[PDB]
Amino acid sequence: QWALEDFEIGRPLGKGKFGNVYLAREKQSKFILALKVLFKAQLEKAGVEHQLRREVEIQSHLRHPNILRLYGYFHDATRVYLILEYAPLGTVYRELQKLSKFDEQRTATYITELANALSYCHSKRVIHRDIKPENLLLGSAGELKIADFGWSVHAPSSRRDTLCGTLDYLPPEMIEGRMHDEKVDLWSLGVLCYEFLVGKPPFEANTYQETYKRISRVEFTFPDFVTEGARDLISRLLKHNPSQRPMLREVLEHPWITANSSK
Numbered sequence: 347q348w349a350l351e352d353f354e355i356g357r358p359l360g361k362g363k364f365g366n367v368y369l370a371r372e373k374q375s376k377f378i379l380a381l382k383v384l385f386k387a388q389l390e391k392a393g394v395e396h397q398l399r400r401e402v403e404i405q406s407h408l409r410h411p412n413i414l415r416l417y418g419y420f421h422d423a424t425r426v427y428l429i430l431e432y433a434p435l436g437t438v439y440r441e442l443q444k445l446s447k448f449d450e451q452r453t454a455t456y457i458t459e460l461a462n463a464l465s466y467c468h469s470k471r472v473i474h475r476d477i478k479p480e481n482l483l484l485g486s487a488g489e490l491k492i493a494d495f496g497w498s499v500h501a502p503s504s505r506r507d508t509l510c511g512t513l514d515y516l517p518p519e520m521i522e523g524r525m526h527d528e529k530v531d532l533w534s535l536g537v538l539c540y541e542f543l544v545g546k547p548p549f550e551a552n553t554y555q556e557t558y559k560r561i562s563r564v565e566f567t568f569p570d571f572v573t574e575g576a577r578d579l580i581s582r583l584l585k586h587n588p589s590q591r592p593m594l595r596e597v598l599e600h601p602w603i604t605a606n607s608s609k
């Protein structure tokens with residue numbers, strides 16, 4: 347069992363509504379990790395305790411290269427602490443703001459990485475991971491890690507979309523006040539891919555109700571440059587009916603994936 351003084355604390359990597367993630371290192375081994383700090387006073391207000399409590403339980407059990415590993419958890423009085431894997435390269439979000447778009451090789455690789463994570467997660471009976479770029483981190487060299495977990499944290503940047511970066515990634519079934527099956531995730535995949543190539547999500551709009559309009563009615567159009575295998579994958583992924591959406595492995599199999607995927 348750990349405690350706060352077992353750790354040296356660096357800068358905040360990102361600041362959230364319930365707390366902050368700090369760069370840290372265990373004092374003895376001098377091994378660097380990321381410490382999520384949860385103020386716990388917003389935690390009651392927001393009515394989230396027991397959930398989080400079993401969430402550390404679940405995510406404790408998740409081992410994947412494309413999933414950020416939760417090493418441990420502890421708490422004191424005012425704060426809960428998640429001891430996390432450190433991802434040196436930061437957010438795919440700032441990367442995407444850097445380049446303004448990715449290419450098909452990068453994109454295809456990220457998408458297979460993600461598909462593996464979600465496939466793994468499903469086999470572990472875990473659904474509805476938050477895969478929007480803000481929640482995705484970059485490991486040692488290029489590798490892509492799903493952060494999720496602690497409700498969303500940001501490093502200072504852009505400013506533009508703050509949130510209201512929200513439902514672009516929400517599926518019609520979720521937004522529409524209904525339940526969801528594992529297939530929720532494959533909608534996000536579609537959206538992600540689009541963004542990667544385009545630089546913006548397919549449903550982006552200057553009002554919430556209009557974004558909704560486009561999502562639930564699945565109204566989205568490709569710029570000239572998007573290749574059609576890309577189009578096929580995306581169109582195949584974004585379907586009002588969950589049942590018409592591919593299974594993950596089918597996604598990995600997709601011809602365009604295999605074509606440009608470095609993995």
Ligand SMILES: O=C(O)c1ccc(Nc2nccc(Nc3ccccc3F)n2)cc1
Binds near residue numbers: 481
């Ligand atoms: O800003 C940067 O250069 C930067 C941001 C993050 C980072 N690595 C990391 N590792 C593990 C967890 C974690 N939380 C987190 C922090 C901020 C936003 C989103 C996050 F999910 N962030 C490295 C650099």
